[PDB]
Amino acid sequence: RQFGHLTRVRHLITYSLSPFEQRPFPHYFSKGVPNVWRRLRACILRVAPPFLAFYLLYTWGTQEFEKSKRKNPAAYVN
Amino acid sequence: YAQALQSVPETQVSQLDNGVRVASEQSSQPTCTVGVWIDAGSRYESEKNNGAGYFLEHLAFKGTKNRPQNALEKEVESMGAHLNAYSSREHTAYYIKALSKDVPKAVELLADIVQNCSLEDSQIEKERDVIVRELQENDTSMREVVFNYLHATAFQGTGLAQSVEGPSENIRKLSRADLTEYLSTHYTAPRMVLAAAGGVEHQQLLELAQKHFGGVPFTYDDDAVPTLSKCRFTGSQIRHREDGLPLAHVAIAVEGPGWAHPDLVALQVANAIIGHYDRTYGGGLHSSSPLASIAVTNKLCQSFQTFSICYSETGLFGFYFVCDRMSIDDMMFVLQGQWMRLCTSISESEVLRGKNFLRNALVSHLDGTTPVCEDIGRELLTYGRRIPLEEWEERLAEVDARMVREVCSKYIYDQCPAVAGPGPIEQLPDYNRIRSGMFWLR
Structure with missing residues (x-):
């Protein structure tokens, strides 16, 4: 698929400025950073949970293993 | 004469x-x-x-x-x-x-x-x-x-x-x-x-x-008489799409100098060189105006026109074309390309005709009474006095190739243009593209 045969688009006025007449930098601290958080806080509660869960299952798993290695002071009290 | x-x-x-x-x-x-x-x-x-x-x-x-x-x-x-x-x-x-x-x-x-x-x-x-x-x-x-x-x-x-x-x-x-x-x-x-x-x-x-x-x-x-607030030129675009229309129009341009500026001459000569086409003409053989020629050979546009619409202290030097939903691109390309050619490798043999072509409109610009008054009406108002055809003559009877180059480039090369396009323009590439169409890969 090429250009000019994509969609029947009617009534959409778009205005954009040359990159040299605008600033790429952009508006960090205004809209910039804000939205970043707007997202960390949006999906944090949807991504992190499982990873967190793994972690536990990792630690638990490891400790226990590292434990099942140490002797039961009472495997021979005699 | x-x-x-x-x-x-x-x-x-x-x-x-x-x-x-x-x-x-x-x-x-x-x-x-x-x-x-x-x-x-x-x-x-x-x-x-x-x-x-x-x-x-x-x-x-x-x-x-x-x-x-x-x-x-x-x-x-x-x-x-x-x-x-x-x-x-x-x-x-x-x-x-x-x-x-x-x-x-x-x-x-x-x-x-x-x-x-x-x-x-x-x-x-x-x-x-x-x-x-x-x-x-x-x-x-x-x-x-x-x-x-x-x-x-x-x-x-x-x-x-x-x-x-x-x-x-x-x-x-x-x-x-x-x-x-x-x-x-x-x-x-x-x-x-x-x-x-x-x-x-x-x-x-x-x-x-x-x-x-x-x-x-x-x-x-x-x-x-109060002098007017300066208007900021803003290289940008505005697209009012509508594939519902027979065809799309495209108009792009760079900032113009202003009546005063003596270069509006050489510049005017510029526009003489690529001129305009319009399917009724009779010329796939046209004069240099390749934009014209090429417009024919590859059936680029229904019609295109070059213009240096200027004002008191600013202006709009560009070009405007009308073309089928489908050949919009090739056109720009070929066209915009011309500007480049125009101010990167334009020849004497070209400007020679350009001039005479202007000297023809120069004269026929004053054809009758109503029109003459127009200039007088205008001349004074925007220029200060009246520019005689004897003057305009010299003004543009002294523009050499190297002068056109020096000029157009001065107002076109690597400048951020303003494009406007209504109609089925899905085919017209973004800005950056028509923008990097301003500098010739010399």
Whole structure:
């Protein structure tokens, strides 16, 4: 698929400025950073949970293993 | 020839202790045309003041207090004179064309309008809905909307960006007053010019103007003409898509110098070289204007035209084309490419023709009375005086290749243009692309 045969688009006025007449930098601290958080806080509660869960299952798993290695002071009290 | 130019009657000019400048050119011609060209326009309008200059032009004829409607027209019709006119962004005029045997009568008439318009509150409330309709017509003239939108984005934010016509909301609410607030504010002698051409004898004109334009300037203000707020050019685009339309229009341009600037010549010659095409012509063999040629060979556009629309202190040097939903791209490419060629490797043999082509329009620009007055009307107003064809001649009879290059590049190379395009333009690439189309991979 090429250009000019994509969609029947009617009534959409778009205005954009040359990159040299605008600033790429952009508006960090205004809209910039804000939205970043707007997202960390949006999906944090949807991504992190499982990873967190793994972690536990990792630690638990490891400790226990590292434990099942140490002797039961009472495997021979005699 | 050159002798033909020289033997061309100088143009007479002399201002009033009033402010008006009265100039004109004389010939044998029974007929003539005369008009007052105000330094008035849309540019001079505000956010709530936009429209007036027009809503005005539209009542500028429906009468005065001295002689109401039915009579003015009846007095005009009855004498066989044609009173027509316009209103741009920085230029408005009102010219009539009679048999020169009416200089004093036409002149009076003129004065009686630019100064006393009925502005019949009942006449207005009609012309109101008239424009609002007449505007709805200007609208499907894609051939135009594409230019306003060009202005709209080219000079975004400033006064030029506002269209001579003005928003519907203003025309829907302009007050009996606001119109007058416009008239009394801008319609003043210092910014108005009484020019004419035909069989008229300057002095007779003067005295009549000097007679019907009994204006009197007290303050220092009244005698001073305000210079306008500079308009920021803004390389950008504005796309009003609609694949529902037969075809799309595209208009791109760079900032223009302004009448004053001597380069507008060489520049004018530039536009001479690529010129314009339009399927009716008869030339896949056309003169250099490859844009033309190529436009034919590869059936690029329905029509394309180059333009250096300029104003007081700014301008719009570009090109505008109309093409099938499908060949929009190839066109730009080929076209925009030309600009480059134009100011990167243009030849003498080319400019040679360019010139002569201009020298032909240069002359035919002044074909009749009405047109001549136009220049005079204009010349003074924007340039300061009148530029004789003998002058323009030299001006552009001395532009060499290397000069065109030096110029066009100076206003086109790696400049951020403003593009405008309504219609099925899905095929027109983004900006960056038509932007990096400004520098030639030399």
